[PDB]
């Protein structure tokens, strides 16, 4: 069934599963035409396919050429997402294929179900959680590889850097969710928090800064604070 607060720990058991977020697949800039009408221009996008347990991120870059001469792009985007997730599963060895795929938006259920008919034993699930996976393009290195792409491309990351050496995946996934929530609510202030201190750097092979355990406590504290600074500024509280 649906993934919610009640069954949150299922995320970190030993059954392989993937989240699929399609928010950033079809990305446009709306603008005015010379005639004073409105038009869109697509920019490169990505499918965000992530394992909660290991941090392995399969970032399929969606190049704007895939939209050329197509109609109903927002609908096509869901079917393109489902086609690429199915292709990814088929490319994995059997023992690496997921037992479940959790989609962050319910409109992906039927497209993914139809593309996965060949895999009757892979459960396709929605979620009641409102995850901030859309903010993946606020991670500078992910945004850079997507915008630089000149052709379709898959790029593999570990979204948890080396955190699993020191913390469980429950805390790793929970830490990723809190950082992404902050970047979605106020990107500028979130990024100020993560980089304010010139002495904490991002390793070439990492996505986030190299915080100590104590520094992560502090960093998580300003993010928890920032999500309240916004929630007050938003609702006046």
């Amino acid at each position: 069934g649906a993934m919610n607060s009640s069954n949150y720990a299922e995320l970190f058991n030993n059954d392989i599963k993937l989240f699929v977020d399609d928010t950033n697949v079809y990305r446009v800039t709306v603008h005015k035409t010379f005639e004073g009408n409105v038009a869109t221009k697509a920019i490169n996008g990505c499918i965000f396919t992530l394992n909660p347990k290991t941090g392995h991120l399969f970032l399929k870059i969606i190049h704007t050429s895939v939209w050329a001469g197509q109609k109903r792009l927002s609908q096509l985007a869901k079917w393109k997402t489902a086609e690429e997730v199915s292709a990814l599963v088929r490319s994995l060895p059997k023992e690496e294929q997921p037992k479940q795929i959790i989609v962050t938006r319910k409109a992906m259920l039927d497209p993914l179900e139809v593309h996965m008919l060949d895999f009757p034993n892979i459960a396709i699930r929605p979620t009641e959680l409102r995850l901030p996976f859309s903010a993946a393009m606020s991670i500078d290195k992910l945004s850079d590889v997507v915008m630089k792409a000149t052709e379709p491309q898959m790029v593999l990351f570990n979204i948890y850097d080396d955190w699993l050496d020191r913390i469980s995946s429950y805390t790793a996934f929970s830490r990723l969710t809190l950082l992404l929530r902050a970047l979605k609510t106020n990107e500028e202030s979130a990024k100020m928090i993560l980089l304010s201190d010139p002495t904490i750097t991002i390793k070439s092979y990492h996505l986030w800064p190299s915080f100590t355990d104590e520094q992560w406590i502090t960093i998580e504290s300003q993010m928890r604070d920032l999500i309240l600074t916004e929630y007050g500024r938003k609702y006046n509280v």
Binding site: L76, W79, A82, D110, P111, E113, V114, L117, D118
Partner: protein, 300 residues
Amino acid sequence: MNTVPFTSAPIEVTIGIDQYSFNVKENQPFHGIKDIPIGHVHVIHFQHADNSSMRYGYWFDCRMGNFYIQYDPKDGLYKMMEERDGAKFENIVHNFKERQMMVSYPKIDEDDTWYNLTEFVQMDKIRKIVRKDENQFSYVDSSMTTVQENELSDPAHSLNYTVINFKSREAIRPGHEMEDFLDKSYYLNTVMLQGIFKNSSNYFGELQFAFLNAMFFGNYGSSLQWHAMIELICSSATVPKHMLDKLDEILYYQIKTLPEQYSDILLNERVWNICLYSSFQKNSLHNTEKIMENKYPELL
């Protein structure tokens, strides 16, 4: 015109013949139904007074044999049987007509309702959906499940309707996933019409039979099948023009005949609102849309 005699009527029962019905009291002198129109299938059906649970009945065609009804006090129901002795049957019926113990199939001469509800329904096709090959007639009741229902449990007592499933490999060509899901023309025209049914007449026959079982017996799996066969056509962008016009006529008479107080259970809101207002054929069912809007505007 043909006759289905009844041995007797030992329990109180509402008896139906096609869209007609009448109440028979415990041990009332009822000995059957005469003047049944030749050329159509028919259904005789039963609801006992004491237990309105289990509507049941028999599909039959008087061209295929001499059939009668006899109550079985062990199994507790009215059973159809075939009489193989022709001169016995005629002598039985003739005696019952002389004593005027039979109701007359009460068809108005202007009235084409039954023809229009059974236009494509053949006994030979009924007997393949309802498998009991030692009889020429077919028993159906409220509780019988369909093959598709039994996949999601007694096979001999099943309705073997053609399985339709929009999220299935049969419905979806590899590499045409989006195309085939959003436009079911492939599945309708190649898989089902050319492949399985062979022609639109057999398709419409099964659709009509499913509706009649839903209406007369409250058979839930028959209702699912009727709606599935409507939806498959309406969700196809490419349907022969003769099929669309015939479909409009078929549905019109089904909606016209449906008891007004059974719509809440027998009509699927999603299917009809999609079929009439969102689908490829939203504009191809003028007669059905007009009667649905004037008779069941709440559902919509």
